[model samples]
Target chain A: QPIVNSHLSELDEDVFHHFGFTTKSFDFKEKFGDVKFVCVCGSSGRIHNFAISMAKLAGLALPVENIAGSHARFVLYKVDHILFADHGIGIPSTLILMHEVTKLLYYAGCKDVLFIRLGTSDGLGVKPGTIVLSDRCVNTKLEPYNELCILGKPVRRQTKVDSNAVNELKKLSENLSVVVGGTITANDFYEELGRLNGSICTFSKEEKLAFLQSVYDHGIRNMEMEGAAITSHCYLTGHRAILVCVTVVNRLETDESTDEFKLFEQLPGQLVGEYLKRNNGIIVR
Target chain B: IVNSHLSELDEDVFHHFGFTTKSFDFKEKFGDVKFVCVCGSSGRIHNFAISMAKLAGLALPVENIAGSHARFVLYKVDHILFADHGIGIPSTLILMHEVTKLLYYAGCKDVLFIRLGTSDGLGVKPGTIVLSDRCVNTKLEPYNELCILGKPVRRQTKVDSNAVNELKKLSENLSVVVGGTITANDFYEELGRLNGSICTFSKEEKLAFLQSVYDHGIRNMEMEGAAITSHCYLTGHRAILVCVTVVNRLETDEVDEFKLFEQLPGQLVGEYLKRNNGII
Candidate 1:
């Protein structure tokens, strides 16, 4: 209901091009009308795994496949009232997926869909394997908005993760280690996140440490690339959103995400499953 | 030489590539890699690697060496490395950083970086290969504007002249042109296409903006040109972007000409490598 694009209604045939779907190809309202929760991640393998895991948890023996058809841009899987997808890497990659999915939800006549990003992140001071539930997302400047250069003009949209959803996720964390804090959504993975080990680093170790410490002081618990884009798009388009990231490594401690970090990669999805179980039964629909 | 901090670290882990300093012997494994070819699709890059192996008469790699990371696919053939960089600037950035670090740690010197893929042509016909001489953002600026540590940093996004020249020489009989490329963050609105679900501009405005881009010497439009060129340039690697046009957006859209001409770029690169390095 909150899609801001008024021009979307004027199109005779809407095409979610990247998703390989069109209005004529499938009846979106009939296919996706019941979608109440959308879970997303960064990799196709991870999202597909999430869908398979979710289906097992929901006790459904339904076939889980990439319903996005021929397009490999992003993978999408549907399981009853939930949709699992991969948004690729950065803000730009996630932004396109957001726009198309937003339109998909709008055209489907879905109501009150909760968009959740279950991801991995570089923690600031938190221990490795701790899942972070973002209350809000800030840019490199510690500013809480996503900046997009649209049609030659700069537009800033507030990155707001519904606090109620964060609190609810935190409540489901009784069996898991979870922290609620702000997330720093960086544009680039290396220099923007203050790692001195990239191919090009203009700053010294002292400068990088000072900047990371400053942001950590501002309540930024973790750093990732897509949090602001995902949260802000959902915020502007009338969807409840939350970003829960399992820490890959504590940046203050080291830059390397070692073999041990793999232990926590699936915690975010498990936590989401637990949340779904708490709110309603694992039987999504 | 890259960052001095790298030398001091006990182990530098390339998170996405699933490689670390201590995990594998980078210099012993990848020291001879002379070229790194990146594309947008995993299948294409995999096939590119396959084609290169066929060209060089070698056995095909069993599986992607990217190693269960799932974000990208990687393969190696003799002195060449192939990777699929996913779709946009952000995705490409991740590959660039990790791959760059991979080459750096391996002590591979003077490696040429090539981004081979398909793009929408501005005015050229479908299947026309465009070799990027330079890249421009949506603002028509020849630089990649980035936010680093909350501050604005603009980096040049120009391809190495010698690399483009070599590609041009190798593509002598092909439908290829060397020109500027316009890289946009958004594929729909910023590229001025009417097909996206949300079209804020009219047809006339879209055409006018596209024509303006064409007049500025941009032959093709894509999502990752600036990221590819800028990253390579910043890291002191000679880089070029060669994209075969799938659609001339000025006239038409959504033509699956990809399958028809997908191998053109790879073929040219293969010939170039054969001629220059005598790899085959």
Candidate 2:
């Protein structure tokens, strides 16, 4: 099964409650048929901007502000051949979006839906603004999975990104300094990212360095909260997913960045643009 | 000294929630705040603020800001704020991080936070108010832990016993239960709602798990309880969690007695603020 098989087994009607819209509201297959590509990000602003860029790239309609509805957790924009959504910040939010979005794609009969997350990452073992194409999302222990608290017990799930997609994405990074390796997804920005302050940090400088060294030794190159969680969920559902995150700052230090915010907003569109333009085969599964 | 990465950026560090560095003057606007009462939705929080005004005998008119944008408008009466934080740990953490950074930059000292929301009951009657004496995991551990970059980080979900006692005493006329709360991740199966068809956990498994948490004397289960309390413990922010259980998971008869108009929990929280903070 491409997604949760039983979620649609014998249901009379289905509701995508989180999106504030339902599967029964529109013709899912017709509306999303041409959506071969799907891109998600952290903020509403970035996603809207990316959607606009994608629209401009394909000469599709420029989406109006707040495309979905009032208090919408996510916004959907349809360019010529792609869809964009804002998956919020951490695992829980991203996880919810992925579940509903995947279900929508499945009901829409989207075959081989290429899921991509274009967001910011805490650059590790690399310079700032360097894009990192994560092959696998590791936890704080450098394990390649997300530890979901299910029924109050820890359920460790395996996560992987599509190698073929990264191979295509890496080709776009030819002149650009894009670093490809494992990504570490955590909960909070401060504590999870190993910052000096906040109540979560109890480790000394040497200890923190040792842990980062352990992560580096384990092949994880980027750190964020949502990349791995998305990758894992997509992989489990047999969706072609990839996490393409640009570095804001290396995790060796704190979050102080010398890079401009405009550049951060632009990297995602550029990476996806090259890939979308380069990929020729539009094989519908 | 710098308190957060927020000082560096001109906007909110997060994506969905709307507060930014340029949103407002932290020192000028929120400096006087000493109490922050947050729930999981906007409607209840706004209603609670209205009820607080009515209960406190203060005719201070309350209004909402950009709620749809998730900018979280404050019903400010100088110090106290009531806003709807998003459901679950991550959404609540986003609000907490932004609010904490804002409060820190504003130089407000000795802030008290209390999480008041709805929860799933355990071996109890529907509509029973629960004061979370402490927070625990599914394993009934006192510490609420999350896998932060694979390293398990834990925080003591301890509640000040005095606050619990005081709130308990204050709830003489109101029916409120004080016990542990089991914070969950996803609402459905994680907290054992069992809505979708993919549920593989049997009734025996569900009942046994509920029994396990009940064995630890837990009275309520909610999504963001542990995260809020744990954050309060870590940041030295005096906090407590009080929620109303809408369904008794033990009975399994579509147990939803939660009506949106039920303001006992809100009134109870308002009473706590009246006694604890004087201005309610």
Candidate 3:
């Protein structure tokens, strides 16, 4: 009857001497397997609480560790020597966190790392409860334009994840509505919110069709902040990465709110659990 | 009367297709000549009048002909063709005129055509009246800043003459104060008037320094136009061209005043006359 017995109930654990885990009596690594999927719930503490609850419900015996980085705090989850970081709203912070985690992975002999960003859509066509799998993220903030109008500049293009990885996720989430599209990421949230109100969200029927047409023309599938930056870095570093987000709120509606805190909390843990259960030999009974 | 009876008259007379017993009626076509030189002057009609008068004084017959091609409007001594449309002020017009005339020479059966431009300095400097023979016009215009200040888009850069011809001219006028350098055509008069205020009959210090640098820098002479465009066109077409000018005004003074105008007219005309007698 050890104090760590409750945490290690059904998981196979391994002990490693390199990183000071053995020295600390309360170290959770000794009693649990590494966390396979990391979920970032944003800066709001309530979001983190919901995420933790969802992880517990999925019976994932993974240990979640938090660290302060850049503008947002992040969670690092280690799975079989693979490290994934879930970062809050700020993109710069997420980049820093990803950099640190990738470095950690490189040191641990992991040649490739997959990064997935889960967040609420900034009110694209997809509604609440619908899941979005982005093919690419178009950053409208950096595009050049004249000062007078809100004319769009050239779309900053990016390649999507491999089809195999995308299909693998698809098979796991049966009820999940998969959308392949592009997302716009902006420097300030308020500015992005303003654009969503002015043009994107308040689109007329014609405008909506035009927007969708333009998006498809560029071969963009979904939109999110951290996805493009993460993917770009991964591509540059010769690493494989993908981003998937569950839409929780529709920014278009006059009076609309989704239980994003609860949805985000449940969606990622469920997806990760199902993925690991299907791909790896690990089974949760 | 003997053919020698027609050769001693001091007055000028014209000989058409039918002419006899007139000393001035004698036509000299140096068909066996090894080379022919062409010269032009840039400024206003007044300036052209003075320059043409000088050439006439040197016993060169001048002809005013409508440009066969809108490109060639002024002709020198009935042989050298000129088309000075004062485009882009002094520089462009001068270059245009020179280039057009040189091309005409290239078309002619002449063995070679040496092209030259005449100019003078303005303002007060001792011996500023010294005439300079030029081989280069830099094609840069300082007045561009004024246009930019007016918020106008700058025009594209263009070579008014043939490149090969310009290179040859560069070689020839290397030691002279070449005018077309940096395209100062439009500002020439304004620059002249500015100098006239400071210096009486002599060249101003600033104007003299400009000329000195132009000379020391191998740009010993300056003209309102011509040279660059002409030389480029001539050499490209296998014709020979040379340019020379006297500095009658400095770039530092107001060139709109009467004194500077008179100086430019007289000096330019004097130089043109000299070129007529000496080169062409």
Candidate 4:
């Protein structure tokens, strides 16, 4: 699978600098050697709460109230082989996260790991609460690829997910509505997506709708900020990665997603737990 | 202050085309923009842009641009660009880069950059408008050092004292003070707010730290002032970090206003513009 993709071959201090914690502080192999599945969400609250379900599923003790002597940037909770952490919003932060987490797995000598990220997204003609697995990720242009500017020039990477894994995870949710399609990732939400509500748009209502329609025809089921970063980083880093997102609102119809936390949170956390339990043993260590 | 959607944004994303650089020729787009002002929250900056418009008697509609990325927003009116620079250093730092790059490309010069935000007062009362004389980091150092491209670049984090004098003169009826500020990285750890923090000191240790910071010339606490001031210093851009203390950190973090977003910072800034920029 080393086709035009790149990954960090060894540990470097530069990559882990911003995270405020590094391999030098602790022995990764001793601590994280059991990590088999890395589960990430976009918020501290979501990841912490989901850690509860995972802890229960894995029969591990509840996470402490507030993490002691941990990085303020991200919260880490581990029980058995499953790791739950929150990657901050957007692609830059997510990329920073993927680099450090991948390095964390690498330095810890964890092998054959599965990365699953769950988040809520604005849908494309899909019903609210429709669980989506990204077969491939599309950019703002609705293309099925990821772009990284390496040295002032764009290096495009294919965002093709493991089709076999998508099928297996989709099969794990037979009792639920799990749809697999391309997820369009927008770097900016309002202007790039051309959202118009309660006022005439500043620019490009027709073009955005037309593009979204084109992607709709192309089977782009969902759109979010970090999905493609996960997809692309996984593609390049040689990690088996997939994004499971719940559509909170149809962008073709609404401007704001649900304010309710109960929208699709608990279910997806449970979905990941079930998927983990069904395929890989939750207590692999 | 034209409330054009030029600098408008959802919380996470910024609108560049609404700007002069991409929407039109960078030179033609912001040729009139002379002063660039930024703030903490998105809603406050748009009004300042609108106020600039009304004072300048512009006939354009200042758009309340919202919804998308809940990150940062930028707006422009005449030769002035106002933006909501989000909450912290990283967020504001990126916006500063974009704005600085745009203005530099537009051949704009002598542009006065200002960060008007709300802060937690060190010992001062709430609603006290404190203009930063110098900004320090969490280590109580006056130098704002950021690691860039692998090397650490240090910048003098001092605001022009002459502009502080002008701000002092303009504060005839307003509550104002010129003091040093500690621009922390986050709200919980750096400032010792104990609400949901994982690591915290006892109330005595927290007070001891605050007293030490106060002794070190910290009059208020902010998230972005050090970054803003440092960028301005390095780029040779004229900038000031003016904030209204909405909460006394030693007293309580919660405010009657809730969330501590203030309009007085912008109002004081509006007057500053009126005196300096030709609006009678």
DockQ of each: 0.54, 0.32, 0.00, 0.04
Q: Provide chain B TM-scores across all predictions.
A: 0.95, 0.87, 0.36, 0.85
Q: What share of the true interface contacts does each candidate keep?
A: 0.54, 0.33, 0.00, 0.00
1 or 4: which has the higher TM-score?
1
Residue-wise C-alpha lDDT for candidate 1, range A1-285, written one tens digit per residue: 454565666667776667887778778899988888899988888888888887887788867978886755778898778888988888878878887887788888876678889899999999989899998799999999988666566678888887888887777677557899889988788888888888788888888888889999989999998998888777777887889899878999888633565568888888888887666524753
Model 1 lDDT per residue over B48-83, tens place: 888888888886453677767556778888888999
Better-scoring candidate (DockQ), 1 or 2: 1
Flag the better candidate by DockQ, 2 or 3.
2
Q: In candidate 2 chain B, where is summed lDDT lowest over 10 consecutive residues?
A: B253-262
Q: What interface RMSD does every candidate have?
A: 2.3, 4.2, 35.5, 15.2
The most accurate candidate by DockQ is 1
Task: Please state the CAPRI-style docking class of candidate 2.
Answer: acceptable
lDDT of each: 0.82, 0.71, 0.37, 0.67
Question: On a 0 to 100 scale, what is the lDDT of residue B91 in model 2?
Answer: 64
TM-score of 2: 0.80
Winning model by TM-score: 1
Model 3 segments more than 4 A misplaced: A1-41, A44-73, A79-84, A141-160, A192-213, A216-222, A249-261, A281-285, B1-280
TM-scores of the models, in the order given = 0.93, 0.80, 0.36, 0.54
Q: What is the TM-score of chain A alone in each candidate?
A: 0.95, 0.91, 0.61, 0.87
How well does candidate 2 score on lDDT at residue B263?
A: 63
Minimal lDDT window, size 10, model 4 chain B? B11-20
